[PDB]
Amino acid sequence: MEEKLKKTKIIFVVGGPGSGKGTQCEKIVQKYGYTHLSTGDLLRSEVSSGSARGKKLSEIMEKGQLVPLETVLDMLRDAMVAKVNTSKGFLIDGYPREVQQGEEFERRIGQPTLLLYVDAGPETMTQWLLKRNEETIKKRLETYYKATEPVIAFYEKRGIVRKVNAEGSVDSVFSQVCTHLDALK
Template sequence: MAEADICKRPIIFIVGGPGCGKGTQCDRIVSKYGFTHLSTGDLLREEVASGSDRGQNLTAIMERGELVPLETVMQLLKEAILSKVESSKGFLIDGYPREVAQGILFEKEIAPCSAIIYFEASDETMTKRLLGRSLSSGRVDDNEVTIKKRLDTFHTHSKPVIDYYGAKVKTINAERDRELVFADVAAFLDTMLTV
């Protein structure tokens, strides 16, 4: 299938702070709508684990504490989308774009995004959820000091993204029970997909 066919599938950027419930909601969207869920973090980890030349270069970059180049992340996303475009009804790009420049590059190199779903939750709620998760997750970044840094980074970089996309953004209150949150997600997607 040609790259032009990507444009025929909805592409939705999923934005929200750590602990807002993005992963839970993405799982439900995949299950109900047949979308493919892509996380840039997962794609980077898979590439590193593959042992490829590119994966070895990524390991070296990360070991130096540097950010992975925008173009590399874009290439991984493009490859993942192209590999699934025939079997997928659409794409959820999770935790992306982290800044406006990434969104602009994505739309220029791959395809325009159809919408952004922004899962909005207070810092207090997200911190409480992450600390609760830390009891069972074993994740080193689920501690109060790191959570505060992650939230600060999210606010600094994601607010401009939400402002930039304006009319394409659907803000959903993620403070509520996951069933109520998903009811709002489904209502939005049902409307968007029938237009």
């Protein structure tokens, strides 16, 4: 069955601002043959598709309303169905932002294999990079950390969280990423 979805590798990739997790996903693509997905890319793709789903989405966005999670997950699942025979695994870049988005992904598609937490860390030198006021930046970072900690705590209970220190270079981050992915199966 498309129960294959329950056997592929599914990595939730989570990181605050300045985390560079987009670059890490592509480096995982090059090395491990995974597929880089994000809900933003699928929405742009679908609107460009001219499909009825895309016309509705543009309407919702002309509406200024919210896109329903069910439609997001239809698109994620379609994209994963089309590549689970030809891909070694999937990166969900920037997902989930809340516990229930994670739980709804699991219901519709399959349970995550890992949650990769790419943490540039709070204000150490992340603050200075985020310009190029500075209390707009601190307000932004703490609201990220408040929203993301229940997601981390939730998946910590399953023991699938792998935390990556993203203070240093791109190369030192991908070093830790490969340690964590090399441990799978």
